[PDB]
Amino acid sequence: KRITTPYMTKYERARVLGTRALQIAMCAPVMVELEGETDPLLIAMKELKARKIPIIIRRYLPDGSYEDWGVDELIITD
């Protein structure tokens, strides 16, 4: 079982969008069908809303254990 909160925090959201934007700025495959957007961060926001981002967030408890959460299975929110 995983005990930590199911909601994506603003810090997780900020760094997933950042790391995905940096990966889309380099020549990575885009998982959504882009529609003439050029700005990498705008493309990363479409992938987050479409739940297509291939990142796992490893939440770290202070004793050193960890939980692997998929970005697609957290509850995203504004």
Binding site: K10, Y11, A14, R15, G18
Partner: protein, 49 residues
């Protein structure tokens, strides 16, 4: 450099640093206060330190 006469640039003070910590903005604080000022590389010997 220090100012307008010398095309100096602007300061991120100790107080602006305290603002950015409170946002949790760890990479922006690394970009502003390392990458766009004084990024460098040193050779460090792992034996003597």
């Amino acid at each position: 450099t220090e100012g307008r006469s010398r095309d100096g640039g602007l300061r991120l003070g100790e107080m602006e640093r305290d603002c950015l910590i409170g946002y949790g903005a760890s990479m922006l604080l690394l970009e502003r206060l390392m990458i766009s000022s004084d990024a460098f590389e040193v050779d460090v010997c792992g034996q003597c330190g």
